[PDB]
Each structure stands twice: as C-alpha cells, then as structure tokens.
C-alpha cells in the first residue's frame, strides 16, 4: 500500500550513452522497500535540456514477485528535471568541417575571379575543387545530434504515479 | 555547561539514581538517564484524562477522544 505521488530515492550505479535505449537498473535506497531493484529506460528529446528515466520493472526480494509500478525521475537535492551532463558534444566539429569546406570553395572561385585585374593558381585549383564535394558531404552528415549521457555515480529521485498493494 | 563545575568534574553516571557523580563524592544536580526523579507539572497534548487521541484521520476538523469525550478546544473552530 503506497500513497499516490510521493517521492523515494534510488541510486544509479552504471552509465550508458544515450544512443541505444535499454533496460537500466537502480537499487532503491530508502523507504519501506529495501534490497529492491528496478529496471527501466530513457527517451531522447529533441532539445536536451532535460532527461528522465521511465521506471516500471520493479523487483522486490523476499518473495518471487514482480510488481510494475511506473514512475518518473527528479534530481535529488536539486528537485529539477535536467540531466547533469554535457550537451555541446558535436557542434564545433561539424561547424569547423563545414566552414573549412566553404573557405576552400571561396578561395578557388574568388582567386580565380581575381586573375584578370603557378603556385597561386594551384592553390585556386585545390581549394576550388575540394571545397564542393566536402561541403555537400558536410551538409549530408551535419544532422547528427549531440548525445547526452547519464552517469554511473549520481542517484535519482523517483516520484510515484499510481498505487500498488 | 559544566554540571560538576567548581568540583572535580564529571566522573560517571549512576543509572540506579539517574544522576551524575562528581569526582568529589557528591551527587550532581544534573541527570543522565531518563528514569530518574523529575518534578514537572506542565504537560502538552490534548484528549487528556481521556481515551487519548483517536487514531483515525477524520475528514472533519472535530477531533474526538477514544473514551467518547469531545475536545473542541483541541479541535478547530467554526
């Protein structure tokens, strides 16, 4: 018998990159249930300003039963929903690749255009033709999002949604 | 502060009398254990000299005692 919408603690012990969702287990560390383990998963948001773990597969020892109370997560001693991780993983790399391909395209075309009014010609040559395919390939691969990653040494706080017996 | 002040100091607590004993062999004026001789006359709580607090969380603000007496001053007012 658990009241609807109260907050309990759990501790997350193993980490995972947010590219393959999967069953992630925590150990419930406070409350009436002790020694109990729980598996769930995450979902990837479009904007990564928060990250939560859906938690439904609850195993309690003593007797071989598996209740399925489903609940969400909040950051303990913070009481907010964000994930304490890095979000700027893959911005600057693709930015630099695109801008370098651009600079090549511009070098070849503009310093060929300035020919009217040897080595400089070959510089025009090289940047002129290696800008283009690399630029369209950079816009091809530019779409990969910046991954988040939950950590193996920070717990989480689980707030209830329904009742169990 | 120092219970055995201006004395030998805290030696040990006698639990049969619930009192500390100073290093000079005198009974102190501080207690150590709960089960000693207190002299207190003011008491808190309500439903007193009655059945105590009825354990059911009632919806109404009136709280009754287990022996049936009604304590409206312990309760809230309308």
């Amino acid at each position: 018998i658990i009241k609807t919408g109260d907050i309990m603690f759990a501790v997350l012990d193993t980490s995972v990159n947010s590219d393959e969702p999967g069953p992630i287990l925590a150990t419930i560390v406070t409350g009436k249930l002790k020694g109990s383990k729980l598996i769930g998963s995450f979902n990837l948001p479009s904007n990564a300003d928060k990250m939560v773990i859906t938690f439904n597969t609850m195993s309690i020892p003593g007797a071989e039963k598996t209740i399925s109370i489903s609940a969400y997560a909040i950051d303990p001693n913070t009481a907010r929903t964000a994930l304490a991780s890095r979000t700027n993983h893959h911005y600057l790399m693709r930015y630099g690749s695109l801008f370098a391909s651009s600079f090549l395209q511009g070098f070849g075309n503009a310093f060929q255009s300035a020919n009217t009014t040897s080595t400089l010609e070959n510089a025009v040559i090289g940047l002129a033709t290696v800008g283009k395919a690399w630029s369209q390939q950079a816009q091809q691969l530019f779409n990969t999002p910046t991954t988040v990653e939950v950590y193996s040494g920070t717990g989480l706080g689980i707030l209830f949604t329904q009742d169990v017996t | 502060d120092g219970c055995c002040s201006k004395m030998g100091g805290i030696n040990y607590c006698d639990s049969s009398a619930g009192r500390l004993v100073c290093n000079n062999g005198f009974y102190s004026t501080c207690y150590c254990t709960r089960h000693a001789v207190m002299d207190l006359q003011f008491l808190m709580g309500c439903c007193l000299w009655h059945g105590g607090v009825y354990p059911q969380l009632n919806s109404s603000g009136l709280v009754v005692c287990n022996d049936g007496y009604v304590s409206e001053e312990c309760s809230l007012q309308k």
């Binding site: - | 006359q41 003011f42 008491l43 808190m44 709580g45 309500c46 439903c47 007193l48 000299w49 009655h50 304590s71 001053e73 312990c74 809230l76 007012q77």
Partner: protein
C-alpha cells in the same frame, strides 16, 4: 444620507456621489476574505494563549483544590462511591390549557453508585488541554497599510473571542464538578435524614481453591446486592433542628 433622508436623497441625486461610489465599491467588495482570515487566526491564537494562561493560573494554587475536593473523605466503608442526587423546590408545570401540575419539592437519582479503586481528583474535571499551534499560514495578504491595520484589529477581535471561549469552557467545567459534588453531599445529607436506603453488599468466602496446576489460597467475592434508593412512604422520616 439616510438621516435627513429627503435632503440626503436630493444630495445623492447630484452626480458627484454617483461616480464617487464606484471607486469605493471595489474596496467594499474586495475586503471580506482578509477580514475573515484575520478573525479566524485571531480566534485560534487568542484561544491558545488564554488556555495556557488559564492552565498556569490553575496549577499555581492546586493545594486548596485538593483541600476542598476530598472525594477520599466521601468514599464509603466498603470502598464505595456514593451516588448522585438532584433536588428541586417549587415545581410547577403547565402541560397545556386547563392543566396545571404543581409540587413542592422533588428528588432524582442521576448517577447510580458503583465500585471504585481510587478516589477521583479534580484534574480530569478541570484541566484545560493545551497544545500550541505552530502553523501560521496566510491565504490572502493585506497588501495596503489600511488593510494591514484592519487585519490587526480583526486579529485583536479574534483574540477577545478566544478569551471568551476559554472562559466559558472553564466555567462549564466548574458547573459540572459543582453538580457532581453537590449530588454526593446531598446523598450524604439525605441518608443522614433517613430518606434513602443504605447500599447493601455481601461477601462470600471460599476456601483453598485452584486445580493441581495453579492455586489460590482464598477466594472472597464481594458483590453489591442493593443499590441506594428512596423510600416512597414518609412514616420513617425523622426531622432535625438546631440551636
């Protein structure tokens, strides 16, 4: 103006007060919740404070209470609490028209006598329960200075109301213990007057009892066989006179 009301109505026909009334209408329509909350919290705080003061004043002079309310003096010889009697003089009832029923004096048993272990004290009759409320929460706040001032004065009125409630409760307890004590002393005086029956008891003695497992070396069982009650015939009534 309702006093010289024709002149006041001729004055309210003027357009100045007609538009003056709107800007005070919002103030006179938006103030009640602050007033009611101030009244309620003043009632709670004043009731608690006066209750604590009353308990301190009561426990300050407890010795004369034990001096006056000696139930242990009134416990009977078989450790019996005497019952409670109520009396009345100049009884008159009117059921309806053409029907008056009169009587001079009357008596009634209220609490039947029963066994006791310990004589009672005054504390279960007269101690006021005290618990400090440490939950001050404000729903709507008095946001202007006039609102805070009237919030203060309604808190003061609630303080007075809680004082009144505590005083009435204390006098209620006084009335109850007076009724009980008067009933017992009235019973004693009537038995001295030989109007009521004495309580009658018996004790049965049984020898060395118990089975082979456990034993009791005696068994005296005491039971009251006759409750006190009045006699309906007046021939056995003895008067009294002093000097």
């Amino acid at each position: 103006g309702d006093t010289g009301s024709l002149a006041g109505l001729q004055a309210m026909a003027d357009s100045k007060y007609t538009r003056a009334q709107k800007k005070q209408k919002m103030g006179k329509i938006r103030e009640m919740a602050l007033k009611e909350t101030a009244l309620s919290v003043g009632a709670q705080a004043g009731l608690a404070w006066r209750a604590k003061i009353i308990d301190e004043q009561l426990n300050k002079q407890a010795r004369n209470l034990d001096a006056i309310y000696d139930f242990n003096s009134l416990v009977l010889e078989h450790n019996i609490l005497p019952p409670v009697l109520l009396e009345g003089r100049n009884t008159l009832n009117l059921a309806d028209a053409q029907s008056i029923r009169i009587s001079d004096r009357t008596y009634k048993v209220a609490k039947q006598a029963h066994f006791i272990t310990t004589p009672p004290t005054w504390r279960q009759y007269l101690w006021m329960d005290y618990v400090k409320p440490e939950a001050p929460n404000v729903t709507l706040l008095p946001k202007t200075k006039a609102e805070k001032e009237i919030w203060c004065i309604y808190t003061e009125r609630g303080w007075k109301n809680g004082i009144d409630q505590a005083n009435t409760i204390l006098e209620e307890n006084i009335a109850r213990i007076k009724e009980d004590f008067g009933g017992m002393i009235l019973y004693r005086k009537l038995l001295a007057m030989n109007m009521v029956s004495p309580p009658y008891v018996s004790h049965t003695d049984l020898g060395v009892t118990g089975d082979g497992s456990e034993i009791h070396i005696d068994d005296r069982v005491l039971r009251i066989t006759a409750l006190p009650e009045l006699n309906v015939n007046s021939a056995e009534w003895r008067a009294a006179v002093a000097k």
